[PDB]
Amino acid sequence: VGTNTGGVLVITDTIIVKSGQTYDGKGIKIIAQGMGDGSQSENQKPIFKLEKGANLKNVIIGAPGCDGIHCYGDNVVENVVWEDVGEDALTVKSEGVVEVIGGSAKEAADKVFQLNAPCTFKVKNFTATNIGKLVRQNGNTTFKVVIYLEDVTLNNVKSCVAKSDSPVSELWYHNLNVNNCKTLFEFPSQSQIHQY
Numbered sequence: 001v002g003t004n005t006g007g008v009l010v011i012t013d014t015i016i017v018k019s020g021q022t023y024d025g026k027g028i029k030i031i032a033q034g035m036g037d038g039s040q041s042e043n044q045k046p047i048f049k050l051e052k053g054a055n056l057k058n059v060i061i062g063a064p065g066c067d068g069i070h071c072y073g074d075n076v077v078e079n080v081v082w083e084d085v086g087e088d089a090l091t092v093k094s095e096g097v098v099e100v101i102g103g104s105a106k107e108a109a110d111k112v113f114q115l116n117a118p119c120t121f122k123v124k125n126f127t128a129t130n131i132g133k134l135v136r137q138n139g140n141t142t143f144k145v146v147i148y149l150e151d152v153t154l155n156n157v158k159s160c161v162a163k164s165d166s167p168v169s170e171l172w173y174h175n176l177n178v179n180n181c182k183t184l185f186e187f188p189s190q191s192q193i194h195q196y
């Protein structure tokens, strides 16, 4: 695929991507050291910190997945492959639009995507296999998120596709394929879920 395909970049601290920047790995795989083991422990660093307005593309995140990507809003994450999700794959930490486009995630013991601030969260052209949950809004929070799942294929989902404890949140899906999943959506009311 890209010119860095077959190279492995070993890091020992979070890669910070600045507002208005695009980090383009060109197919590089990233392996983090001393930042986490990819377990469910809470004491782990993100591989990437995407400030507001920062973008990320064309990276493979190898094990250990540590705490994945931290997004501070208005970010695009294109063609990112998590080969072995760590504590979680991506976390929305501050408000704005975040779009995951292309790529894949496998082997998430619990959540893939964690939403900890009001946001518009899009997952597009994306495959995930062997996961607990694809999207979680932070537990017991009642701020509003709006999730879009568009051309998403999921295989082996232990808990559900998406969970939220917020009655004002919404999920919209279009061309969603799901195999071997306990239950699709855990929201206060199933009327919060829509197709388009």
Ligand SMILES: [Ca+2]
Residues within 6 Å of the ligand: 038, 084, 085, 086, 106, 107, 108, 109
């Ligand atoms: Ca894992």
Ligand code: NA
Residues within 6 Å of the ligand: 067, 087, 088, 091, 114
């Ligand atoms: Na996390």
